[PDB]
Nucleic acid binder design. Structure first.
Length: 79
DNA sequence: TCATTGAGCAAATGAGCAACACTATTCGCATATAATGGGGTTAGTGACTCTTAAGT
């Protein structure tokens, strides 16, 4: 299930490119979020995979670029 | 008899600790229609040397 939606990870992380982080770091952290979405996925709500996986991939990419992008790190609640 | 030396002492202030109670920070977790392969250089170098590789 994980190695069939990596194209979804590169499709999400295509837009977060020039935000202070490398392109390969983004899709790596998106893969971490994709694994966390695979482990907690429920099929009985009719949705296929993508509407549940997109939120977790976007969350992992945003929490990656909110912390590991600057030296003087501001937490996400303060920013 | 009194100034001088040797020793100490109560007290005031500066530093700090120990345990406890309130509170502002910080981090783990969740978002359910569908979303399914990227930008970005270097472009009018010169000369020389070392290694690898096809050609003889």
């Amino acid at each position: 299930m994980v190695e069939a939606n990596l194209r979804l990870v590169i499709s999400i992380a295509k837009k977060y490119t020039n935000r202070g982080l490398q392109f390969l770091d983004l899709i790596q952290e998106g893969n971490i979020g994709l694994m966390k979405a695979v482990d907690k996925f429920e099929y009985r709500r009719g949705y296929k995979f993508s509407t549940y996986a997109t939120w977790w991939i976007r969350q992992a990419i945003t929490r990656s670029i909110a912390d590991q992008a600057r030296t003087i790190r501001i937490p996400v609640h303060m920013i």
